Amino acid sequence: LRFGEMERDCMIAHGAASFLKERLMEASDAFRVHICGICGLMTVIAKLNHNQFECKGCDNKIDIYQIHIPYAAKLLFQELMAMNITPRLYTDRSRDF
């Protein structure tokens, strides 16, 4: 069934932070990708079982993180990339507030 933008509005109104995440992830397209701590893309060749992670053209075999995002977000990121846009994802803050 649909948990549309409007269905999201109400949840935000309710302050039901956890139920919204649950609905948007665990209940539909939650997914696990590997980020590069340097270049911030899903470039990581993740051979998990051999415990091998590498971002060639970064020589990054250390700075690797796993993140949980919707598959549509992953798709969107790969879609933005196909149009030469880099949606770099970083797990640490720079600017502050």
- Note the residues at the interface with Zn ion (CB under 5 A): 36, 38-39, 55, 58
The continuous run of DSSP H or E covering 73 comes out as helix 71-81
55 is in an annotated binding site: yes
Binding mask 38-77 vs other proteins (x if CB under 8 A, - otherwise)? xxxxxx-xxxxx-xxx--xxxxxxxxxxxxxxx-xxxxx-
Distance CA 51, CA 40 (A): 20
Among positions 14-43, residues that touch other proteins (CB under 8 A) are 14-35, 37-43
Distance CA 36, CA 83 (A): 20
User: From other proteins, Zn ion, none, which one binds at residue 3 (CB under 5 to 8 Å depending on kind)?
Assistant: other proteins
- Which residue number is nearest to Zn ion in terms of Cβ? 39
For residue 80, the SS3 value is: helix
